[PDB]
Design a protein around this ligand. Structure first.
Ligand SMILES: CCNC(=O)[C@H](C)NC(=O)Cn1cc(-c2c(C)noc2C)cn1
Length: 129
């Protein structure tokens, strides 16, 4: 933990209500699994370290950070109540990339590849049972 980076998003909290659903299960076993192993996943596998990357303004611009390392912890810890909360995390991660970086930057193309997979899988999100 460098003190000039924020604390990561919460991945545990006993006061937050929690539930398993078939949809959250799919999000872990199918969606995360698929995206995590992708060739271009590695920048999204942990919070942005703005100190190491020499991007002092990152957390001035990006006020709601998210990454797949956090999402994986949230899924594995059953932090979520529903699939929408998890899907919103993924959407936040993509949008933060697209807001902070120039169109056609490598990092943007990488995010775009992951988001394309994501959309395919979320289109097949099972009916809640
Ligand atoms: C703590 C370990 N961390 C790394 O291994 C290093 C520090 N990360 C990288 O080199 C690659 N990276 C680029 C970004 C990024 C994203 C996402 N959106 O905009 C930017 C800019 C995030 N990670």
């Amino acid at each position: 933990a460098e003190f000039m980076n924020p604390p990561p998003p919460e991945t545990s909290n006993p006061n937050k209500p929690k539930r398993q659903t078939n949809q959250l299960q799919y999000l872990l076993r199918v969606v995360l699994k698929t995206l995590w192993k992708h060739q271009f996943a590695w920048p999204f596998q942990q919070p942005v370290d703005a100190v190491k990357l020499n991007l002092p303004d990152y957390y001035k611009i990006i006020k709601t950070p998210m990454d797949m390392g956090t999402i994986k912890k949230r899924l594995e810890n059953n932090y979520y109540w529903n699939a929408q909360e998890c899907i919103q995390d993924f959407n936040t991660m993509f949008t933060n990339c697209y807001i902070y970086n120039k169109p056609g930057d490598d990092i943007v193309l990488m995010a775009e590849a992951l988001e394309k997979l994501f959309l395919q899988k979320i289109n097949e999100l099972p009916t809640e049972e």
